[model samples]
Target: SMSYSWTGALVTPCAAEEQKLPINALSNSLLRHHNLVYSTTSRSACQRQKKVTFDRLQVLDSHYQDVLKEVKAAASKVKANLLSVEEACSLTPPHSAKSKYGYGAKDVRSHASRAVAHINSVWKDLLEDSVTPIDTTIMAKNEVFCVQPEKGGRKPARLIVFPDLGVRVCEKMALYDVVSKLPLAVMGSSYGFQYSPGQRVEFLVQAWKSKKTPMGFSYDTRCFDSTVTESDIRTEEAIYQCCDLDPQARVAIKSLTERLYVGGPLTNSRGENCGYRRCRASGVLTTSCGNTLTCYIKARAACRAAGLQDCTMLVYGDDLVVICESAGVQEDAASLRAFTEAMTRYSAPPGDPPQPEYDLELITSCSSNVSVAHDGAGKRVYYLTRDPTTPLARAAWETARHTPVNSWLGNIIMFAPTLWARMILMTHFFSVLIARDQLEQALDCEIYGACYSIEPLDLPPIIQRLHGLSAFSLHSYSPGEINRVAACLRKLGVPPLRAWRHRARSVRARLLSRGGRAAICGKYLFNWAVRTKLKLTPIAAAGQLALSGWFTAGYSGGDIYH
Candidate 1:
């Protein structure tokens, strides 16, 4: 007979008599129950002996109070430094020339060239020593695909149709048939019934999508209203005027038009009406009209030269619309080609044209020895003279020229204060991030149980500077405060460094500067201290600094203080 013994059925007794259990011990223990019995008894005994303790956690309430305080301090310190830089760099706006065309064209051109060079230099420096981490092979596999949902049996094609408000009723109906059947999305930026017509068009587009063979459609209703009286017509007239006017008046008009019309709503309220009336009263519009007539004549000559004929001109309000319909597609193309040639020939400088009051070279003088070269692929690279003209150099010459001194002064007056404010904010944010990093590193080692032997956190000063320069400053102060608080723990012989007193004093000084420039200065100084002077990598420092700003911007809230 085969028999199997079960381990759960019986407990083995100790064979030695020396190991006999006492009655009190026996009551508390059994062969099979020893483990379970010991655990239950020990747990109950320990529970009864626990020391009773209570502690009150302190709570402080001031929405963003600490953060704001730290930011204010940091901003003050940076502002002073930025002010010095601004002064040294001569960033103050240059004096304007008194010529009727505002600053002389030559001066403006010269300044723009110099500014571009300065920007390029800064960009090159920023990229130095930076390596692209990923190989091209690795980058190739990373792909982005933009997908659109399919509709009906036909693949969708996008179409845009603009209907004239003045179209005949039959034309309107026909347009609606073409428009309504297509799948579309109508877009508008206006509010309410002002947008009703466009919205109606949108509804039609949506309706089209429900059909068995739905076509995709979209409409931008916000374009329904004209900002200019027949804008296209005016654009053509402006082009003619550009070719017709005296050089000075042409430049003046171009500047005035850009200021008044470009990217702005054309309406009576915007003073465009007044501007138009002024131009007309001054005979500027009349001159432009004469020029347009001449342009048509020139276009005819060009058509002849290109061996083409039959050109029609449409005048709408202030615009000239031309349509040339040729006998064949190639003929039409030739006529179209001739159109530009004719305009260019007739618009050439008149034989006895009035001598420009100002020398064209004087008006358009660019800085000497500055050249722009493009590679075969058309990427522009600019080279500048070693001693490039600085803002100070320009300002000195402008002041000497005795050009419209007030205009230049006014521009400077209007621009300087605002620029100062922005610079201050930028500097303050940078300084605050630096102080916060110092605090966080201290806290991580002390309160967070991080080992002292671990590598020191590498925070860079430049990243903080960039962050300060950006619009993210307002929200970046919070983390700085948290890190500072953590660092504060080190002074109590915690695991973190014991250098809080000195750092806190430095931070306080940064926060109290009147305009926050000091903080900006401090950021640069801190970078210099740790990276350049101390021989650490600037990139590493920047990475650590950026982390501090990011943390401050996120996570920390009222509850942390409470």
Candidate 2:
């Protein structure tokens, strides 16, 4: 055990020789000493240095002098007006005649709303334009304010203030006054802003008591020193405790009819006599004898010794566990047996339950239709399959198939060297390529030959050679690009290359073997020729299509493909 004491003493006055200084001068000297000591020891070293610096001290002194002068001027102006305090306090809330320039209750509300909107707009703009390539980060800081009136109409109203930001010297004084005053409501609220790297931001709000009258300016200001860590701010346990309903409810009910006493673990702390150095040095012999059990036994024994009737011991655990009525020895023995049985039953393993099986099924359906279409260059008409399924497949497949290509291309462009190469290739092709109209017509014509019917014609060879070269260029440059092209084609429900080649060979053999108009299978041959020519660099065609905004939204680098 530790003991403490306090001493109170008084000092005697000094002799006349020691009291040579004037009283006013003595007071001034003491004041200067007090100020100096407060300045040096009251703040950190850096702050003390700043306070003592000649330049800063001079600036502060001048600032206070100017403030004093302004205060005197304000006093003179108010004195000349000669209005009673009550008359000044009776002035109504400021108002303006012009609706836009005026102030009123409604105007105050509108201004508040406008301020909120301004903050929201800044937040929204930051979120929208945040996809820039810069690595900057931003955070939100907010604040709140409140005021309230006092109990007695004659007494001055109380004011409250709070800060969410880390504690500052002025904020401490403001907070203390607000809390001390009490009985407050919300009045005006405003938030300050700051943007900095490597700094944590916070928000604060306060409520305080305030009067409608004018002369109510006096307020208490005090500072407090507290040690609250940052980690304590956002955690649930640091702020509040949540009660356990079931256990608490039971405890409350039990307490209604009977007096409840709690007991727990205990230890023996008795010393033994010994001659050896180690034994002698050991202060006492302490033993852990199932402390909870010992406490319960001791409490029950004491209760029985006191002749208390209907005294029940509620043993809560197994070690040294037993409950009893003070007068019933038989009841104590039965409780022990019953408790053991209950524990044994609880410790036993449970049996496994049976499992169930699942069933499976499949269903299918189909339909077909046909339409007439111009096939050759004004030479023939043919029946075409109007398969809804194929068109549906084409629509759905285009996006999924091309998205991966676009993503891959976007990533490649992020790598500077690859991007430069691609840019150079694009420049060369665009500079020498034919006009868009020619390309459009080629793509739009009903009969391919009709579209290719320009002077200096031989368009089939030009198209075939260009398509083949483009495909080969892409495949050689990026084999993975070719794999993506194949995947897209498969998603479009096109057959694999081996199967397509087999089907084409069979068709050609059948046409050549048959003779006459059937032997002239020129339409089928023409279509096959076009496909084969374009197939040379299908990857490049897919990449270009993907880059053309059609699949832009889904292009999240290579993430979508994965």
TM-score of 1: 0.15
The C-alpha TM-scores of every prediction are: 0.15, 0.13
lDDT of 2: 0.20
Q: Quantify all predictions' global Cα lDDT against the true fold.
A: 0.23, 0.20
The 10-residue segment with the lowest total lDDT in model 1: 134-143
Residue-wise lDDT of candidate 2 within 444-500, one digit each (tens)?
111100111121122222222222222112212233333543553343333444444
Point to the candidate with the largest TM-score: 1
lDDT accuracy of residue 165 in candidate 2: 13
Candidate 2 residue runs with Cα over 4 Å from true position: 1-460, 464-477, 508-562
The local distance difference test score of model 1 is 0.23
User: How big is the RMSD of model 2?
Assistant: 40.7
Judge candidate 1 at residue 450 and give its lDDT. 9
